[PDB]
Every structure is written in structure tokens, then in C-alpha cells.
Amino acid sequence: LSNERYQLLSQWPDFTTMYGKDFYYRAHPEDLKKFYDAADEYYKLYETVTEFDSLSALASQVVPNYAARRRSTVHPAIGSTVADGAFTNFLLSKQ
Amino acid sequence: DRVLSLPAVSKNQVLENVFHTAPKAPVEHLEKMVSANSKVYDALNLQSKRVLIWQVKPALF
């Protein structure tokens, strides 16, 4: 999943081609604050999508709630569609 | 009132309107993407000492 987000940071336009002073001084002073803030934003997004050592601790936030759903008092593989279809065997039989 | 014939906009107010933003360094893009690709090297290379390939697709021994 972190690859599908990295692949759209691959398609980011090269803002460093507009770092020269012939873009600094032609530009409105508030549209250059925004341009320098949108370049600082890309380094925020890119330095956290390549923090792949943080994906192992994110997987441990998914495990314990999943593992408690598998500690079912009925069956580890039970679900609604089976337990609904096994209600009609219980209900539409005699008592 | 000779001071009223001088330009009223200060030398300070020129320097704060001309150099309004601290300009972006040329090497700032290198040393920020290199430190972020050093984490792409580490996790995803197969020669790195800390690869993710053995904790993502474990092994079959």
C-alpha cells in the first residue's frame, strides 16, 4: 500500500527547476511563499512514505483485533453467511 | 524640510521587500532526497543490512 502512495509521489512536478532568481523576482511575493511551502510539503510527504521501518509497528495495530475475532467461542472460521444459512436449518426444521 | 524630498521609503523597507523570502539552496534538494532515499536503499535493496524482504515475505526453509 505504501508503494501505491510512493508511485504518486513519483509523479510530482520538479519544483526545483523553478528555484532560480528569474522565477523569484518575476513572481508575486505571496505566490512564492506558497511555492516554497509546497516544496517543503513534498519533503514532508516523501520522507514519511519512505519510512519503511515504521510499517512493522503499524502491522501490530492490525493483529490483536484480528486475533480476537479468531478466538470465537463458536469457530475460528465462522462468519455471518454460514451462521445465517445454518439458522434456516435450525429454524425451518421442527423446533 | 529637506527630508521630505528624500525618498520616504526606507533603505530597510527596500531590503525587506526585495529580499522578502530566504531563497532555496541548490543543495537543499539533494541532501533531503538523499537522506530519504537512504531509507529506500535500506529497506528495499537486497544487499542492505536491514532489508525488509525477510520480514515481509518471510522464507521457506
PDB file of C-alpha atoms in Angstrom:
ATOM      1  CA  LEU A   1       0.000   0.000   0.000  1.00  0.00           C
ATOM      2  CA  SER A   2       2.917   2.303   0.733  1.00  0.00           C
ATOM      3  CA  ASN A   3       4.054   1.680  -2.829  1.00  0.00           C
ATOM      4  CA  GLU A   4       0.809   2.977  -4.306  1.00  0.00           C
ATOM      5  CA  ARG A   5       1.362   6.206  -2.394  1.00  0.00           C
ATOM      6  CA  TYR A   6       5.012   6.355  -3.390  1.00  0.00           C
ATOM      7  CA  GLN A   7       4.070   5.953  -7.034  1.00  0.00           C
ATOM      8  CA  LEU A   8       2.076   9.166  -6.927  1.00  0.00           C
ATOM      9  CA  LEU A   9       4.965  10.989  -5.304  1.00  0.00           C
ATOM     10  CA  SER A  10       6.889   9.792  -8.349  1.00  0.00           C
ATOM     11  CA  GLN A  11       4.601  11.931 -10.493  1.00  0.00           C
ATOM     12  CA  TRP A  12       5.242  15.147  -8.631  1.00  0.00           C
ATOM     13  CA  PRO A  13       6.465  18.038 -10.802  1.00  0.00           C
ATOM     14  CA  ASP A  14      10.084  19.057 -10.378  1.00  0.00           C
ATOM     15  CA  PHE A  15       9.663  22.243  -8.409  1.00  0.00           C
ATOM     16  CA  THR A  16      13.425  22.701  -8.150  1.00  0.00           C
ATOM     17  CA  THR A  17      13.508  23.765 -11.787  1.00  0.00           C
ATOM     18  CA  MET A  18      11.826  26.994 -10.625  1.00  0.00           C
ATOM     19  CA  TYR A  19      14.273  27.820  -7.846  1.00  0.00           C
ATOM     20  CA  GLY A  20      16.231  30.366  -9.846  1.00  0.00           C
ATOM     21  CA  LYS A  21      16.131  34.085  -9.247  1.00  0.00           C
ATOM     22  CA  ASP A  22      14.448  34.705 -12.575  1.00  0.00           C
ATOM     23  CA  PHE A  23      11.438  32.994 -11.022  1.00  0.00           C
ATOM     24  CA  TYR A  24      11.986  34.564  -7.599  1.00  0.00           C
ATOM     25  CA  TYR A  25      11.678  38.118  -8.834  1.00  0.00           C
ATOM     26  CA  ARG A  26       9.063  37.741 -11.516  1.00  0.00           C
ATOM     27  CA  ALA A  27       6.683  36.119  -9.065  1.00  0.00           C
ATOM     28  CA  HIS A  28       4.221  37.669  -6.674  1.00  0.00           C
ATOM     29  CA  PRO A  29       5.741  37.603  -3.172  1.00  0.00           C
ATOM     30  CA  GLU A  30       2.837  35.572  -1.780  1.00  0.00           C
ATOM     31  CA  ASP A  31       2.800  33.063  -4.630  1.00  0.00           C
ATOM     32  CA  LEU A  32       6.444  32.437  -3.871  1.00  0.00           C
ATOM     33  CA  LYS A  33       5.758  31.774  -0.216  1.00  0.00           C
ATOM     34  CA  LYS A  34       3.208  29.220  -1.385  1.00  0.00           C
ATOM     35  CA  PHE A  35       5.631  27.715  -3.873  1.00  0.00           C
ATOM     36  CA  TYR A  36       8.304  27.373  -1.210  1.00  0.00           C
ATOM     37  CA  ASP A  37       5.732  25.873   1.142  1.00  0.00           C
ATOM     38  CA  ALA A  38       4.604  23.371  -1.474  1.00  0.00           C
ATOM     39  CA  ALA A  39       8.209  22.299  -1.900  1.00  0.00           C
ATOM     40  CA  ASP A  40       8.648  21.872   1.848  1.00  0.00           C
ATOM     41  CA  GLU A  41       5.440  19.859   1.852  1.00  0.00           C
ATOM     42  CA  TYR A  42       6.741  17.344  -0.676  1.00  0.00           C
ATOM     43  CA  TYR A  43       9.715  16.630   1.527  1.00  0.00           C
ATOM     44  CA  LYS A  44       7.311  16.042   4.368  1.00  0.00           C
ATOM     45  CA  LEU A  45       5.283  13.562   2.335  1.00  0.00           C
ATOM     46  CA  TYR A  46       8.289  11.870   0.770  1.00  0.00           C
ATOM     47  CA  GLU A  47      10.265  11.435   3.970  1.00  0.00           C
ATOM     48  CA  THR A  48       7.339   9.696   5.631  1.00  0.00           C
ATOM     49  CA  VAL A  49       6.345   7.405   2.775  1.00  0.00           C
ATOM     50  CA  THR A  50       9.899   6.066   2.717  1.00  0.00           C
ATOM     51  CA  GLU A  51       9.882   5.465   6.453  1.00  0.00           C
ATOM     52  CA  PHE A  52       9.501   1.749   5.860  1.00  0.00           C
ATOM     53  CA  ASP A  53      10.819   0.844   9.299  1.00  0.00           C
ATOM     54  CA  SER A  54       7.546   2.197  10.666  1.00  0.00           C
ATOM     55  CA  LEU A  55       5.433  -0.303   8.760  1.00  0.00           C
ATOM     56  CA  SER A  56       6.234  -3.133  11.146  1.00  0.00           C
ATOM     57  CA  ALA A  57       4.744  -1.327  14.113  1.00  0.00           C
ATOM     58  CA  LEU A  58       1.690  -0.447  12.051  1.00  0.00           C
ATOM     59  CA  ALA A  59       1.095  -4.119  11.400  1.00  0.00           C
ATOM     60  CA  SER A  60       0.916  -4.712  15.148  1.00  0.00           C
ATOM     61  CA  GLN A  61      -2.051  -2.384  15.345  1.00  0.00           C
ATOM     62  CA  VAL A  62      -3.966  -4.661  12.989  1.00  0.00           C
ATOM     63  CA  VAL A  63      -3.011  -8.040  14.545  1.00  0.00           C
ATOM     64  CA  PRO A  64      -4.601  -8.009  18.062  1.00  0.00           C
ATOM     65  CA  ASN A  65      -8.112  -7.034  16.993  1.00  0.00           C
ATOM     66  CA  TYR A  66      -7.979  -9.596  14.197  1.00  0.00           C
ATOM     67  CA  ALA A  67      -6.679 -12.286  16.517  1.00  0.00           C
ATOM     68  CA  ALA A  68      -9.508 -11.692  18.985  1.00  0.00           C
ATOM     69  CA  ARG A  69     -12.088 -12.178  16.255  1.00  0.00           C
ATOM     70  CA  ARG A  70     -10.488 -15.541  15.578  1.00  0.00           C
ATOM     71  CA  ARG A  71     -10.824 -16.506  19.240  1.00  0.00           C
ATOM     72  CA  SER A  72     -14.514 -17.052  18.672  1.00  0.00           C
ATOM     73  CA  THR A  73     -16.410 -19.286  21.039  1.00  0.00           C
ATOM     74  CA  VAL A  74     -18.079 -20.891  18.013  1.00  0.00           C
ATOM     75  CA  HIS A  75     -15.305 -21.477  15.471  1.00  0.00           C
ATOM     76  CA  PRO A  76     -12.202 -19.703  14.123  1.00  0.00           C
ATOM     77  CA  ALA A  77     -13.648 -19.762  10.594  1.00  0.00           C
ATOM     78  CA  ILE A  78     -17.240 -18.862  11.405  1.00  0.00           C
ATOM     79  CA  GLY A  79     -18.902 -15.987   9.615  1.00  0.00           C
ATOM     80  CA  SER A  80     -22.314 -14.470   9.022  1.00  0.00           C
ATOM     81  CA  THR A  81     -23.146 -16.245   5.753  1.00  0.00           C
ATOM     82  CA  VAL A  82     -22.531 -19.687   7.234  1.00  0.00           C
ATOM     83  CA  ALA A  83     -24.287 -18.876  10.503  1.00  0.00           C
ATOM     84  CA  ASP A  84     -27.250 -17.413   8.618  1.00  0.00           C
ATOM     85  CA  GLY A  85     -27.513 -20.438   6.360  1.00  0.00           C
ATOM     86  CA  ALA A  86     -27.257 -22.671   9.402  1.00  0.00           C
ATOM     87  CA  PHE A  87     -30.103 -20.791  11.049  1.00  0.00           C
ATOM     88  CA  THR A  88     -32.539 -21.901   8.360  1.00  0.00           C
ATOM     89  CA  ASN A  89     -31.541 -25.468   9.082  1.00  0.00           C
ATOM     90  CA  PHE A  90     -32.303 -24.736  12.717  1.00  0.00           C
ATOM     91  CA  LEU A  91     -35.432 -22.658  12.247  1.00  0.00           C
ATOM     92  CA  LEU A  92     -37.083 -24.338   9.269  1.00  0.00           C
ATOM     93  CA  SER A  93     -36.719 -27.719  10.915  1.00  0.00           C
ATOM     94  CA  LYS A  94     -39.091 -28.783  13.662  1.00  0.00           C
ATOM     95  CA  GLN A  95     -38.270 -26.979  16.964  1.00  0.00           C
TER      96      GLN A  95
ATOM     97  CA  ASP B   1      12.174  70.240   5.190  1.00  0.00           C
ATOM     98  CA  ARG B   2      14.864  68.725   3.004  1.00  0.00           C
ATOM     99  CA  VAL B   3      13.969  65.320   4.434  1.00  0.00           C
ATOM    100  CA  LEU B   4      10.611  65.498   2.663  1.00  0.00           C
ATOM    101  CA  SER B   5      12.405  65.500  -0.683  1.00  0.00           C
ATOM    102  CA  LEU B   6      14.256  62.293   0.119  1.00  0.00           C
ATOM    103  CA  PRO B   7      12.522  59.040  -0.855  1.00  0.00           C
ATOM    104  CA  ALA B   8      10.172  58.243   2.010  1.00  0.00           C
ATOM    105  CA  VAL B   9      10.522  54.500   1.604  1.00  0.00           C
ATOM    106  CA  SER B  10      13.448  53.493   3.786  1.00  0.00           C
ATOM    107  CA  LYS B  11      16.516  51.527   2.845  1.00  0.00           C
ATOM    108  CA  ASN B  12      15.183  48.959   5.290  1.00  0.00           C
ATOM    109  CA  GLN B  13      11.839  48.755   3.511  1.00  0.00           C
ATOM    110  CA  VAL B  14      13.611  48.177   0.223  1.00  0.00           C
ATOM    111  CA  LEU B  15      15.676  45.327   1.633  1.00  0.00           C
ATOM    112  CA  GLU B  16      12.656  43.709   3.226  1.00  0.00           C
ATOM    113  CA  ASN B  17      10.592  43.996   0.029  1.00  0.00           C
ATOM    114  CA  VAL B  18      13.354  42.938  -2.339  1.00  0.00           C
ATOM    115  CA  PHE B  19      14.706  40.079  -0.235  1.00  0.00           C
ATOM    116  CA  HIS B  20      11.337  39.034   1.092  1.00  0.00           C
ATOM    117  CA  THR B  21      11.857  35.253   1.317  1.00  0.00           C
ATOM    118  CA  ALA B  22      15.033  33.380   2.152  1.00  0.00           C
ATOM    119  CA  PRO B  23      15.844  31.660  -1.151  1.00  0.00           C
ATOM    120  CA  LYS B  24      16.017  27.910  -1.544  1.00  0.00           C
ATOM    121  CA  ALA B  25      19.528  26.489  -1.575  1.00  0.00           C
ATOM    122  CA  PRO B  26      20.590  24.335  -4.551  1.00  0.00           C
ATOM    123  CA  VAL B  27      21.938  21.563  -2.309  1.00  0.00           C
ATOM    124  CA  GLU B  28      18.841  21.513  -0.089  1.00  0.00           C
ATOM    125  CA  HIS B  29      17.047  19.285  -2.590  1.00  0.00           C
ATOM    126  CA  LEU B  30      19.983  16.905  -2.798  1.00  0.00           C
ATOM    127  CA  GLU B  31      20.599  16.388   0.908  1.00  0.00           C
ATOM    128  CA  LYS B  32      16.883  15.983   1.637  1.00  0.00           C
ATOM    129  CA  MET B  33      16.181  13.450  -1.088  1.00  0.00           C
ATOM    130  CA  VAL B  34      19.427  11.570  -0.457  1.00  0.00           C
ATOM    131  CA  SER B  35      18.606  11.083   3.222  1.00  0.00           C
ATOM    132  CA  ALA B  36      15.145   9.900   2.192  1.00  0.00           C
ATOM    133  CA  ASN B  37      16.461   7.583  -0.491  1.00  0.00           C
ATOM    134  CA  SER B  38      18.929   6.168   2.004  1.00  0.00           C
ATOM    135  CA  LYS B  39      15.804   4.733   3.612  1.00  0.00           C
ATOM    136  CA  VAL B  40      14.699   3.402   0.219  1.00  0.00           C
ATOM    137  CA  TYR B  41      18.116   1.806  -0.080  1.00  0.00           C
ATOM    138  CA  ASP B  42      17.991   0.349   3.413  1.00  0.00           C
ATOM    139  CA  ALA B  43      14.611  -1.272   3.236  1.00  0.00           C
ATOM    140  CA  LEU B  44      14.460  -2.353  -0.366  1.00  0.00           C
ATOM    141  CA  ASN B  45      17.820  -3.293  -1.828  1.00  0.00           C
ATOM    142  CA  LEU B  46      18.719  -6.999  -1.098  1.00  0.00           C
ATOM    143  CA  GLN B  47      22.280  -6.001  -0.226  1.00  0.00           C
ATOM    144  CA  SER B  48      21.417  -3.713   2.663  1.00  0.00           C
ATOM    145  CA  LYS B  49      22.000  -4.883   6.189  1.00  0.00           C
ATOM    146  CA  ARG B  50      18.418  -4.002   7.153  1.00  0.00           C
ATOM    147  CA  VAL B  51      16.264  -5.294   4.315  1.00  0.00           C
ATOM    148  CA  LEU B  52      12.553  -5.759   4.653  1.00  0.00           C
ATOM    149  CA  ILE B  53      12.496  -8.798   2.374  1.00  0.00           C
ATOM    150  CA  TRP B  54      12.795 -11.309   5.210  1.00  0.00           C
ATOM    151  CA  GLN B  55      10.115  -9.768   7.364  1.00  0.00           C
ATOM    152  CA  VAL B  56       7.710  -9.080   4.531  1.00  0.00           C
ATOM    153  CA  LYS B  57       7.912 -12.295   2.518  1.00  0.00           C
ATOM    154  CA  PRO B  58       9.391 -14.444   5.256  1.00  0.00           C
ATOM    155  CA  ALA B  59      11.269 -17.548   3.922  1.00  0.00           C
ATOM    156  CA  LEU B  60      10.613 -21.208   3.268  1.00  0.00           C
ATOM    157  CA  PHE B  61      13.148 -23.404   4.977  1.00  0.00           C
TER     158      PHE B  61
END
